[PDB]
Design a protein around this ligand. Structure first.
Ligand SMILES: [Mg+2]
Ligand SMILES: [Mg+2]
Ligand SMILES: [Mg+2]
Ligand SMILES: [Mg+2]
Lengths: 279, 278
């Protein structure tokens, strides 16, 4: 009953798209990697997870990298080495998040993350990106089975989204993506985490809706829709409307930011939705 | 702008204390600096702000440093070099927030912050502390008269507190304070800024109430109580109770953290109340 949002899948997808068309208007665009770039990305991905003895096929990597291809802001890219680092860091932390946690060898993995950062970023940016990656995968480790997670995720939407600012990876995302754009204001918003805080709900609500069935079947509690009775059409749709209102207020405030910054923020939110709803 | 929360000053003070007595219980305790340590701190503060030309008296310094003496967690302190750094970094960024922006010389001030961090912290912590200080003062600068400040501060409690995570300085505070304690869990929560997100509303709500009259008289908008009509006793009491409920919910979640970490969070919120009402 509460095991599935399947009855709402089409309507909610329509409503998400309708909101974006009214409030963001500009559609997201795909980044094309040359086959050299893509093999380079994938090679780095393989080298970084090999110490954990894990093999991962090219097409699995390409499914992982799709979110980065779709959710950056191609208008504004200025550094494609930073872009590739984000492709790599995203994919390997994807692979890390999808392993038995008693296969997690930090001594083996963290230095691979540092090597990626040092390859693609300047000296200062390498440290910023690496600390963000370190802090993300460290958060993930220390909150498995944590009473803190249960408290933040079951108490209120406000407590849950506060947890997700880090846990969904959007602070990590912002802190390794600002070198792509070299835009002073965006760099500051990324480093204060305001960038992450402005985009967390737009990203998390979409992510949660389309992974609800999988996550609750796996016993996972990091999902906002577990806060309403999904089996109750009236309660579900009041909750979903509240989440839509959350996304709209965020997007309306995001438009107070400078133009380039707001472009990146909205391409992220809307691009993630497009990527999420594709094959 | 000609508004005031004076008619509620007593009752809100009593309501605040009562909430803390029921939900935190543990009293905050003042850190007493020896005479040598207070001198070392004032000397460092005076050095840091000497390049900006203007003078700060001992008594102002000591009024600034009191929030640090009261709002840390004394039973858990392990590193007093780190503690002194927070005294100095708090005081001088206070003085900087208190200056006409027309005199905000970053090229003079940022090396002084870096100097403080390099004297008191290990090399890794010194970069964390410095970067949070840099990000804090840079945020203050780019949001003065910025349309983003006006949109975040006037739209809803949620957008306003989202802005204050950085703007009230608690993220900076966490990221320079964790070396005081060398507690692994607290260090991570500081570095993910979860520590700052848990404590922002309890700090900001207290700070906003007791600075409201001052701030509205100066045309400042960074105060959540501008979001209700404080001249409407009925509206103010509903808004004030909403913010108490926010503090209570946060405090109750804070107690799900490990025992040392939660002591630090709650001593910070409760000690800030004590210092503000002192
Ligand atoms: Mg995860
Ligand atoms: Mg998910
Ligand atoms: Mg201020
Ligand atoms: Mg104030």
């Amino acid at each position: 009953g509460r095991s599935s949002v399947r009855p709402y899948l089409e309507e909610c997808t329509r409503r998400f798209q309708e909101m974006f068309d009214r409030h963001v208007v500009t559609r997201p665009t795909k980044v094309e990697l040359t086959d050299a770039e893509l093999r380079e990305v994938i090679d780095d991905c393989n080298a970084a997870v090999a110490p954990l003895g894990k093999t991962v096929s090219d097409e699995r990597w390409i499914s992982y990298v799709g979110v980065v291809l779709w959710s950056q802001s191609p208008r504004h890219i200025k550094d494609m080495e930073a872009f590739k680092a984000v492709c790599v860091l995203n994919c390997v932390t994807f692979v890390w998040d999808d392993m038995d946690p008693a296969l997690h060898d930090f001594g083996l993995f963290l230095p691979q993350l540092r090597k990626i950062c040092e390859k693609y970023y300047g000296p200062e940016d390498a440290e910023v990106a690496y600390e963000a990656a370190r802090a993300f995968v460290t958060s993930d480790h220390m909150f498995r089975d944590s009473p803190i997670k249960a408290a933040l995720c079951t108490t209120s939407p406000e407590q849950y989204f506060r947890f997700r600012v880090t846990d969904i990876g959007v602070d990590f995302w912002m802190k390794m993506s600002y070198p792509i754009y070299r835009h002073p204001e965006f760099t500051e918003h990324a480093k204060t985490s305001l960038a992450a805080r402005m985009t967390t709900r737009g990203l998390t609500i979409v992510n949660d809706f389309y992974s609800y069935d999988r996550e609750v079947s796996l016993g996972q509690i990091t999902n906002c829709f577990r806060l309403c009775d999904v089996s109750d059409e009236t309660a579900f749709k009041e909750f979903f409307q509240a989440r839509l209102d959350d996304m709209i207020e965020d997007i309306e405030c995001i438009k107070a930011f400078d133009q380039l910054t707001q472009d990146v923020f909205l391409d992220l939110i809307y691009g993630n939705f497009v990527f999420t709803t594709s094959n």
